[PDB]
Design a binder for this molecule. Structure first.
Ligand SMILES: Cc1cc2nc3c(=O)[nH]c(=O)nc-3n(C[C@H](O)[C@H](O)[C@H](O)COP(=O)(O)OP(=O)(O)OC[C@H]3O[C@@H](n4cnc5c(N)ncnc54)[C@H](O)[C@@H]3O)c2cc1C
Ligand SMILES: C[S@@+](CC[C@H](N)C(=O)[O-])C[C@H]1O[C@@H](n2cnc3c(N)ncnc32)[C@H](O)[C@@H]1O
Ligand SMILES: [Cl-]
Length: 630
């Protein structure tokens, strides 16, 4: 059982000995058929011993990538783990984070961020062609497990073996329990030098191999995501939600990061509301957007829960979010969402009466329920994260408004309309003020003002248990303050944040206009004129922008022949300059994954989504779309 898994997969790949001699900060494992996580857990255990033994070794981080067609339920997993008492503490940590069986990639951060696990739910043969370039020449060791080739040969094909080899780092290796000739030959022609060796207790034979030379893969240069060359010296310009997260995700990898915030405090931009909704944006199309939002939402709740379990404090309730079909238009949208077959734990159609049963108040309409969503307080959250970011080594310079940005001799010159500063690597996280630079002003980002009202609760109002979405939204009472949030105005190209009376009334009218069949909405009282204004940064396709800051003039020039050639050059970018923004009204949900993607990209690591989704999040994607045909 345990000793076997060890013999085949860890020993068959050089471990535990390779740990000590590994030349890199992290090591990438890739596994076919996760199952109950035996291989992963056995590997975790060994990497933990190693880290205790040699706290000073090059290898600090571990990245495990795995495919599973039939993801088990967490109970199943707990039942099986009983076979192995000594993996219990690792097993427990993995079960505390098992995700719902939703299709696609689910990144789990384990062992205090020393371990990144990517769970890809789906049939491996179908997923492979869809994957990103950041997987090419990346894998240190394969764990080629699965059903026995004779009992089921459906996965052991040339397409699989080739992709494996394509994703393997030169010098990297694989091992598998099986011995079957066509596998031998299948892996050899894929590009490995294969050795046949005896299995555990000479019961059955098995195979191991090494990739002697890098394979020159199918590649997609136009949407290339390059790494930063130096992560020892980084500045973020921002101070909003996406900065805290971005900072945090870089300090997991040991980057040194510095914060420059225009305001006296963080979260004085758009991340500063009292209560914001958190739920996924579905559309039933299975496009880039849905796929992204499916991972981002679940990831977001995971991270916010981990944070929570570690003492970080912010007002919030995962009370579930109820989205209402109040409209011919909205009802049609909800109807299209509900075409994909979601787990009820993710999203569920429900009737007026069910939603009203849950809500505590008559909801006037049927709709869709998101049981894991809720509200949180973005202000408290951003302050909390900036602080932890600080405590873990991020120097912060508030009242520091960047005024000029210049690259002169390997360094970014920063000027502050106070002491000027220079940095090797810079990230822009400025929200709506993102396209204000020579360097960023060709990006199709827009500013959209919004005002959220603050309203006292009432005995009947206090009853509401869900966040409600219509043409606008109403949160439950915050127990700590006895007030709700109801919003929001949406003013394109308006960037002022002065309180407006017109917009205050509109927030109530939206609620009354959309739920005319019931009477309790009348209890919403905006007459105290308390509200908050802020500016959103919107993108016409609804996905954020995260990556290398692209070079407009250099792109149109470099890619004139593009449409024709479907080996080209990788995309033109401003050196060591990256960004993350364009979160519109869904940043609570999208920030954590965009944050992680940036850190991941800047460390040249493999990324947690497929080629089209990643492509669809790239800063240069809008330019690349015109020139992608003419
Ligand atoms: C009315 C309204 C309602 C919303 N409702 C929701 C909701 O229900 N759910 C949800 O998820 N999200 C909601 N949002 C927020 C949405 O997610 C935002 O897009 C998100 O908060 C973006 O945050 P950010 O960190 O990218 O930028 P911001 O939070 O706006 O931060 C930008 C930062 O950059 C700094 N800065 C800017 N320029 C400079 C300069 N040049 N030099 C130094 N520092 C600079 C500012 O000081 C600020 O700290 C709402 C927003 C608004 C305005
Ligand atoms: C031996 S079991 C899992 C053992 C696993 N190595 C462990 O550590 O527990 C093999 C697994 O392969 C998965 N599998 C089989 N075919 C697959 C495919 N085409 N794509 C993804 N997973 C597959 C099965 O669902 C099954 O969970
Ligand atoms: Cl908000």
């Amino acid at each position: 059982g345990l000793e076997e898994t060890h013999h085949v997969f860890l020993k068959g790949n050089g471990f535990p000995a390779r740990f000590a001699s590994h030349p890199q900060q992290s090591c990438i494992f890739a596994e076919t058929g996760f199952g109950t996580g035996l291989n992963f857990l056995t590997l975790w255990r060994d990497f933990a011993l190693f880290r205790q033994q040699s706290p000073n070794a090059t290898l600090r981080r571990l990245h495990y990538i795995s495919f599973e067609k039939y993801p088990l339920h967490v109970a199943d997993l707990a039942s099986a783990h009983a076979r192995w008492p000594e993996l219990a503490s690792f097993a427990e940590q993995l079960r505390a984070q098992w995700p719902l069986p939703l299709a696609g990639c689910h990144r789990i951060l384990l062992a205090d961020g020393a371990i990144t696990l990517d769970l890809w739910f789906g049939d491996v043969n179908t997923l492979l062609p869809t994957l990103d370039d950041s997987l090419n020449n990346q894998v240190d060791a394969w764990f080629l497990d699965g059903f026995a080739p004779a009992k089921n040969p459906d996965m052991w094909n040339e397409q699989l073996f080739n992709a494996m080899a394509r994703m393997t780092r030169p010098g990297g290796t694989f091992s598998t329990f099986t011995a079957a000739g066509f596998v031998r030959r299948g892996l050899q022609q894929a590009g490995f030098n294969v050795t046949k060796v005896k299995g555990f207790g000479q019961k059955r034979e098995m195979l191991t191999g090494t990739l002697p030379q890098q394979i020159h893969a199918p590649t997609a240069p136009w949407y290339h995501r390059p790494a930063a060359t130096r992560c020892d010296d980084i500045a973020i310009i921002g101070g909003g939600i996406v900065s805290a997260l971005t900072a945090l995700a870089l300090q997991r990898r040991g980057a040194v990061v510095t914060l420059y915030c225009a305001d006296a405090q963080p979260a004085q931009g758009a991340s500063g509301n009292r209560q914001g909704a958190l739920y996924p944006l579905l559309n039933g199309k299975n496009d880039a957007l849905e796929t992204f939002f499916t991972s981002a939402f679940t990831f977001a709740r995971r991270q916010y829960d981990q944070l929570l379990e570690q003492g970080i404090a912010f007002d919030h309730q995962w009370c579930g979010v109820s989205q209402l079909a109040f409209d011919d238009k909205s009802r049609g949208k909800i109807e299209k969402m509900l075409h994909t077959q979601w787990p009820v734990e993710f999203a569920e159609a429900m009737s007026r009466e069910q939603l009203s049963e849950l809500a505590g108040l008559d909801c006037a309409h049927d709709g869709i329920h998101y049981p894991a969503g809720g509200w949180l307080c973005p202000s408290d959250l951003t302050h909390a994260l900036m602080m932890l970011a600080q405590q873990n080594g991020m120097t912060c310079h508030y009242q520091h408004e960047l005024q000029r940005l210049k690259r002169i001799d390997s360094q970014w010159q920063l000027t502050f309309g106070q002491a000027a500063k220079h940095h090797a690597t810079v990230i822009l996280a400025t929200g709506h003020r993102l396209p204000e630079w020579e360097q960023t002003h060709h990006l199709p980002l827009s500013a959209v003002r919004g005002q959220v009202s603050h309203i006292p609760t009432t005995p009947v109002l206090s009853q509401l248990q869900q966040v409600l979405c219509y043409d606008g939204y109403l949160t439950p009472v915050n127990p700590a303050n006895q007030h709700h949030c109801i919003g929001a105005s949406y003013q394109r190209g308006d960037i002022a944040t002065d309180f407006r009376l017109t917009e205050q009334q509109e927030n109530r009218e939206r609620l009354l206009r959309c739920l005319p069949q019931v009477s309790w909405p009348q209890q919403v009282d905006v007459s105290d004129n308390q509200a908050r204004c802020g500016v959103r940064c919107a993108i016409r396709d609804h996905l954020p922008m995260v990556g290398a800051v692209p070079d407009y003039a250099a792109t149109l020039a470099q890619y004139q022949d593009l449409s024709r050639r479907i080996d080209i050059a990788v995309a033109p970018v401003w050196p060591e300059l990256f960004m993350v923004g364009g979160l519109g009204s869904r940043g609570l949900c999208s920030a954590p994954l965009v944050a992680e993607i940036l850190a991941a990209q800047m460390f040249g690591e493999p990324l947690p989504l497929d080629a089209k989704t990643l492509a669809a999040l790239n800063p240069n994607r809008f330019w690349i779309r015109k020139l992608l045909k003419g």
